[PDB]
Recover the amino acids of this structure.
């Protein structure tokens, strides 16, 4: 049912668990914000799957062969041809990570006053869109905002919402469609190939461009192979290649499905757009032949992207996350369903029924999880959404969750059992979790550096 | 009951993951001899725990700081102070691995005609003793020769057997006592501290030297902390240091409990013998400051020896092997008991009761294990026993076993489940396992290059 | 006169060593543009000293100990304490390289309509200043614009020019003073400590902030120790620490004097500005605890910054460049004087007097240098100057040069002889060097992808 | 005349020079024996070219891909096919270093009472020969024992001495001919292909086997390409392959011309001899599939052997040594001529004319070189030869030299200038070097651990 690791351990990293009394003082030192905890004080660090992956022996062999030249590096050509072969795009510009590519795309394809629509948003992607004068519109299906609803391909774009946007606003006022695979905020939920084919069908008829947020496209491809009829005989590589044939470009964070600790890139097919991207990348990232990355990192990212296409690797990656989610569900712990490809999301509304959203249950639950287990998790609720135009009123999203994000090839099933057993025991006395109050809030992006205090 | 890994994965090693029908063709190409399989064709390689360990990030950092000087390397001095601090011996000479140190010890401490006694033997250790003119005498307790007998500290030396040897032959005719921790041939069985203190008491009264075969002393130290009363408050380091306080020297294979892939050393307290050891090491290994080792390897062994002292590491190491043994026992699979610190031994005679020892049941069971799971194990029965060269007849041992030897920090519990589930599945249909016949047998060391075919 | 390397070679990098007739075919394939050569076809790559450095064994040991956590990495804290100890600034935000830090500084410290003044400019620094609405004013001393003038500390700011700006425009209309050490565009010319103290004296009296472009501050510190009276007893570290005591912050490119292949950071003393910097870094680079960098790269930069403080290292670095300049000057080759800390600039106008600037003598000389020696150099003349987009006419700079930029710890004196002997041999028959004509010119950034053919 | 390094520096190792007053105390602490100095106290360590080489980026990439399996490692198969391809031998057995292979060969091919003849000897090779009951006979040409005689191919075997040995002793009493390439004790002197062809011609006519000591065969191949008529058009690989076609086997120390820090192997063509070697290697070294080496070290040795065949690499290696020798000769310093492939030998008899061989001028000169320059060198004189059968009488060889041994790819020409300038200045007051007296002498192999005191 759950496969063993399709690899061996080459090298290990020592870990240690500090006692509860010290975890409590660390949590108070961090202002009850898991973002402010020190890495050395964490047993199992499930804060994010971004850049926290373990590399292979092949990737580390490439690390010893870094061609650090400013132009014409062999590492760049290797990364270039690999992406052209696997993704099928004509041009590629490397960037130091995903939000570097998003900065380039938002300045190239957005006119002040236009609309950008997509299946939910991400914080950095939406910021660069809004900074360049766009208004974001969520066109994901309504069921994606309901945590407990267990349906397949929750991340699909609602075609009726997309049709309604084109009719009310016009096609000329739409910059592009931003299709994310997978959808991070909905719980790592996949998008079906039929939805990608249908979106491409409707947008091309109105001359609207489609750009993918491809950070977790490999996990998305596995869900297509597993659950969409007609793709069970297709390889992961074939599905990934067909996915991108419905996009005019993409922004990629190699720190996710490329199995590296740093790196990203921007892809496109248009020649004029690629020429403008090279003029903008030298301002923010670097030369088009390295783009803010060391040669050895372009090499590791090229090798890692090819390793991710192995069916056994991605099957184990996804089913390890599913294993953690199944143990939590079997004990009655409320989670977002279905389990996504990279994380399990605890439903803090049901976990902390005795608390209101104004008491920040997700931020308080993440603090209690660390103090009780030594596991770091990320708040994904009201604090990440922010406040807008009303003086002091928070955004209220339906999803008030705590994210247990699994780095790739770093932890074992026994580590998943430690996480599950500690959360299940915490769920027994969930009424003890206390509310939080803002003692410091930045002007923007409060989730990263805000400090709180108990109620 | 079974702890999770007290570390996370830093880097992984790629494996093939070939299907069963291809593993069958690989096994036929190897003549149904697991010793002839190529490493690249193996999922889980349980052939040996020697030199197959995974190193830590700290060790690989030391690998980058290799002082490769021919004499006076900083890496040697680091290894020297580490062993002097942890083992308590005065002098140390590095060797490329354990049998290099045994070659030196046998030439230094044995006069032609003397006797060497010890708690059973190992192949290379007994050869160097006999090569230099010694006669080996087994003084282990009788209970060590009972495979199914589940008692603690099976590797203890029988004090009455040792007393009888001293009286009949004399103390001047005894070269030394060779005390192995643990006892590999008995199944990795530990020796009690009380037995070590008693041997030191008896030999010192007759002027007899005691040298340890300390290859797996860390695993032995854990058994003392776990099962011997009075040591439950002692750290692993304190137990190890007290163990060697009853010996005049030791031979160590770092490829086991020092958590490296190559290396060993020879320790002693006598100054004159250390002076002769330095003259002999330059003939066979190298300078006393590197002894057949690269500088970076002395550094990794010094770092690894200190990492082995962590209680959580060695507890998990031993309980990971115990997990495999308990799962096999709970399903009714016959194993050697009790489970040792480094391996589980399947009883192939009881596993393949429908086959005779002339049909090589252990060799045939090892072949089936690979084909069904991709797991390589080692035959330890009539094939590895060899032939008597005078009569031409096989040596026939009471132990017809298959050894599942677990490298340190390489595999997870999920890998142990792969091994267990496939063997349990084989045991349910064990009547289908067929005998083997020699199609090629070399003159000597037939275990390594013999080829077979089904009967 | 010229010291030997204060280090030995730990590991080497393979090179092709292709003959002259093949280098000619490579140059023709590259359209006679050294920017289009492949790295694998280059023996000595003097294109830039940015990110091309060789690291030490200590740095590579740190590469194995990367803490890749998203927040609170131990590598960040190590980098933080190192910069606070060596530079003396209160706060630090890491960036993926120098132009990432410049993007942050320009958005934080510039109000639309204000002025920025500095000792000449750099391309990326001036862009981010002008992008945020500033007007750049050159306040360097007039002597910096004389190529052949051999005087010390050519990069000093003219205090009278700075005083005139404050009086005519007002202090409230001045964003900050951008003091670069060293001054790249003037040829890597250093700034005196007395000039730094005087600028801090004048700006502090008017409430004006001073930010350093500290990319090559270590090379600058050596010039102070070597040529400025009163600092001959001071260590490199003491001089560096005193330099930054006259600044309110700095932007650093670790790819230069931090002896790494990627990395940078932003420093400042003000608490409120540091609070705003943490909100802005998560948009463009990443979390304030990694800032677009892998953990291992923050570790290598922390180790490399401390290695750069060794007097013997920086003395050899600078005198290796001086050796190349002295050998060219002793043979009569026209170079920019005095020789800077990181590169030698050939005067291509005097080298190719028989050619006009419309025939691209610097671009043609760089092509001949590669074909004759396998050395890549960078054109810094009319081609890299660009075209005015309104008129369509080339920008015509007084400096028509070829830059021989020396990476740190990569090449030896024998490699410098290869460069010198081939250029001296070319200078003896310089009348044979032919002009070039555009066969392909891109719309922008023509230096990188233009292709030429002989005239 | 002298080529630059045909590689770039990938990573560096920090070095440091301790003052003279500390170098003096270190030399006294070492008993005036450079073998007892600590590596950290040495600026330029010219003690040996064995295992002190710098590896390439390709080799370090292979280090990350160590297949550490006990049998069937991919690293072993790579090393096996590389040696079969480059050396042309049928079988190969890996060993941890050269003297491990010599131990195997001496036990396989020597009967007690037989003679072994060769072009001079080495300490470990002659010991294993004499330990197994052989009597060594030097059959090198007489001119090899004259330090100042500058003739080509000084290491050739005298065919008349070989013919005389066969006639006086008989062919059945000759175990084999041990042909070393190059000849270490004569100054690294090459053997001509014509001499190898002639030796093979004479021995095959009497049924006598020939085994090569191939540790520095690549350096030998370069001398053949440079100085022997008819081989100037042949590649290094072709010459190496033809060299071994005149041998029945070889012993190799990879620590020399394979550009690694540890490793060796034994080659042969006979099937019965290879079968016996596998039985003996498991006793002393390990399995025939790893032979006392980690997988990653077999990989580095396989990659390094192929890199050594590059003409530019070996040309620079040899001419860098020649550069040091030419500077010493141009200043009047007495050296062994011609300069060998791996070291310059100072003639201590002419250097210390005022001292007798009983005062150990070579051992005293090596001590003075370190104290005055921080350079470590090796004594190669009376102390290395030993005493035999007379009670207290030393062996007296014509060569009383001090060896300046150059590791491969570690030092630069500027480092050679530091060595030369310090020795030339020492030669000005050579009358100050004092004699030495034995204060401690081991029973055997006194050169490594003897301690001395001034006269
Ligand atoms: C869908 C998606 N797009 C873009 C980014 C930004 O990419 P980057 O610049 O970090 O490489 C992220 C980052 N998500 C991370 C940070 C997370 O989920 O924790 C993401 O999840
Ligand atoms: C010709 C020759 N053969 C064999 C050996 C022994 O090989 P090893 O066991 O050291 O790999 C050496 C070692 N010479 C070294 C030690 C030297 O000249 O310093 C040697 O020079
Ligand atoms: C108890 C014991 N002593 C000595 C040795 C020899 O040490 P080297 O292997 O380091 O020379 C071994 C190795 N046992 C290995 C070979 C096994 O169990 O497969 C051993 O188990
Ligand atoms: C003085 C100076 N400031 C800022 C920068 C930009 O820093 P990053 O390159 O780290 O973004 C550079 C780089 N100069 C390089 C590009 C050269 O001289 O080729 C520089 O020389
Ligand atoms: K770089
Ligand atoms: K070495
Ligand atoms: K990271
Ligand atoms: K190994």
């Amino acid at each position: 049912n759950y496969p063993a690791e399709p690899f061996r351990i080459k090298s290990v990293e020592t870990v240690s668990m500090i006692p509860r009394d010290e975890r409590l003082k660390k949590m108070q030192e961090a202002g009850y914000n898991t973002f402010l905890l020190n890495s050395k004080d964490i047993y199992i660090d499930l804060l994010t799957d971004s850049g926290t992956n373990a590399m292979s022996d092949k990737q580390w062999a490439g690390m010893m062969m870094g061609d650090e030249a400013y132009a014409g590096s062999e590492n760049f050509y290797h990364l270039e041809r690999t992406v052209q072969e696997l993704f099928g795009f004509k041009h590629i510009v490397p960037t130091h990570q995903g939000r570097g590519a998003e900065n380039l795309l938002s300045q190239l394809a957005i006119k002040p006053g236009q609309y950008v629509a997509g299946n939910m948003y991400f914080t950095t992607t939406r910021y660069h869109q809004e900074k360049n004068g766009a208004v974001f519109v969520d066109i994901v299906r309504d069921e994606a905002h309901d945590a407990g609803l267990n349906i397949a391909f929750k991340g699909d774009i609602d075609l009726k919402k997309l049709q309604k946007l084109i009719d009310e606003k016009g096609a000329e006022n739409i910059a592009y469609i931003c299709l994310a695979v997978t959808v991070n905020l909905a719980g790592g939920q996949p998008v079906s190939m039929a939805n990608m084919r249908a979106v491409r069908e409707l947008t091309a008829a109105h001359g609207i461009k489609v750009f993918y947020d491809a950070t977790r496209c490999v996990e998305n491809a596995y869900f297509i192979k597993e659950q969409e009829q007609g793709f069970e005989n297709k390889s992961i590589a074939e599905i990934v290649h067909e996915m991108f044939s419905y996009a005019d470009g993409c922004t990629m964070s190699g720190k996710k499905d490329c199995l590296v600790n740093i790196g990203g890139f921007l892809c496109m097919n248009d020649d004029e757009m690629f020429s403008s991207a090279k003029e903008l990348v030298v301002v923010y990232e670097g030369m088009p032949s390295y783009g803010g990355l060391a040669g050895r990192d372009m090499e590791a990212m090229a090798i890692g992207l090819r390793e991710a296409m192995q069916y056994e690797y991605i099957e184990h990656r996804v089913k390890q996350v599913r294993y953690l989610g199944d143990k939590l569900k079997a004990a009655g712990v409320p989670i977002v369903e279905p389990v996504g490809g990279h994380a399990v999301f605890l439903d803090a509304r049901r976990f902390c029924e005795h608390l209101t959203q104004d008491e920040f249950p997700a931020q308080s639950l993440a603090a209690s999880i660390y103090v009780e287990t030594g596991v770091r998790s990320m708040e994904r609720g009201i604090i990440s959404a922010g406040r807008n135009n009303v003086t002091g009123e928070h955004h209220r999203p339906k999803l008030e969750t705590v994210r247990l994000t699994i780095p790739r090839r770093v932890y074992t099933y026994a580590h998943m059992d430690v996480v599950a057993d500690g959360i299940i025991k915490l769920y027994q006395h969930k009424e003890d979790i206390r509310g939080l109050k803002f003692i410091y809030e930045p002007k923007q992006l409060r989730a990263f550096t805000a400090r709180f205090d108990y109620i």
